[PDB]
């Protein structure tokens, strides 16, 4: 089953872009101290969400 | 003044439903096609076959004639 794993890695290369346009990093973002979620998103992102949703 | 990010006025919905649409064409319906081009096949092939017969026979008559 070639395919649907490269349809599928496309969809989540749009969400490792969210996650670079949250933090900065591709997959092993921190993000989260015990505390709360440090340095909050960016003017912009939640309608990108709603796009992707 | 504040910038957080919230939702613009909130935001519009997303669907989670399974959209298959089962098409389809009534199967019984294309056993009817599948029969229909098989016995056109047959017609045409018999038809086919009984006239290069035919010319089959003008090429024995081709080695009777010749022979002697």
Excluded at chain 1, 6 to 23: G, T
Excluded at chain 2, 34 to 62: K, P, V
């Amino acid at each position: 089953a070639m395919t649907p794993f490269f349809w599928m890695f496309e969809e989540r290369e749009k969400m490792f872009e969210f996650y670079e346009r949250v933090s900065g990093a591709r997959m092993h973002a921190a993000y989260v101290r015990p505390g709360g979620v440090h340095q909050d998103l960016p003017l912009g992102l939640m309608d990108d969400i709603y796009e992707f949703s | 003044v504040k910038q957080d990010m919230p939702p613009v006025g909130g935001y519009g919905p997303i669907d989670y439903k399974r959209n298959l649409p089962r098409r389809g064409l009534s199967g019984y319906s294309m056993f009817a096609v599948g029969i229909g081009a098989l016995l056109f096949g047959y017609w045409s092939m018999m038809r086919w076959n009984r006239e290069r017969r035919r010319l089959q026979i003008e090429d024995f008559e081709a080695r009777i004639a010749l022979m002697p």
